[PDB]
């Protein structure tokens, strides 16, 4: 029981650490500028779109080579829930709210990326198999 | 929740329209024997 508590304490610390990350800020946009984020970037694993306090949070979609859109899972982060972190890095995204549409372009797309050797969002936390079996 | 409605006009009336048109075309051709 001592080992588990120390382990989860260290895990929480390692998550909140977030040290040694690379941020890509080369993002352009075109379309209906009234649903636009105030900031968009990514850290090589997730893509973040920060929205101002007075803006409605729109729906964000994944655009492939042919221009088709597909759903992508998202989590809402930030102190005031103003950041939407989608779980993928992609060259082009589409933001939709109602009948308005905005296109987001990743102008420094890294095809290689960084591998997820651990199983968690952090490189300093490992997901280990407990079930054994 | 509402949106655009497909009513399937052709799937509902194409059998009837095609059957009637082919019947009338065959009748016309048969009358054209004289």
């Amino acid at each position: 029981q001592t080992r588990e508590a120390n382990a989860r304490a260290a895990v929480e610390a390692a998550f909140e650490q977030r040290v040694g990350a690379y941020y890509n800020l080369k993002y352009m946009m075109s379309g209906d500028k009234d649903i636009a984020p105030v900031n968009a970037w990514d850290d090589g694993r997730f893509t973040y779109f920060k929205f101002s306090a007075n803006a409605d949070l729109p729906s964000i979609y994944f655009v492939d080579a042919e221009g088709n859109e597909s759903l992508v899972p998202r989590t809402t982060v930030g102190s005031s829930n103003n950041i939407i972190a989608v779980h993928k890095v992609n060259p082009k995204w589409m933001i939709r709210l109602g009948n308005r549409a905005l296109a987001i372009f990743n102008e420094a797309y890294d095809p290689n990326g960084v591998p997820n050797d651990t199983g968690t969002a952090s490189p300093a936390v490992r997901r280990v198999n407990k079930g054994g079996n | 929740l509402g949106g655009w409605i497909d009513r399937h006009f052709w799937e509902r009336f194409g059998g009837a329209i095609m059957i009637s048109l082919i019947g009338d075309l065959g009748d016309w051709a048969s009358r054209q024997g004289s």
Partner: peptide, 28 residues
């Protein structure tokens, strides 16, 4: 003879950066 309409495609003309200023979550 009729197909479900597509959503609005954004105009690809007014292309400008999203980031006017560096976010503070980058700690800058």
């Amino acid at each position: 003879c009729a197909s479900a309409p597509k959503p609005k495609q954004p105009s690809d003309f007014n292309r400008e950066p999203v980031n006017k200023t560096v976010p503070v979550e980058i700690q800058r």
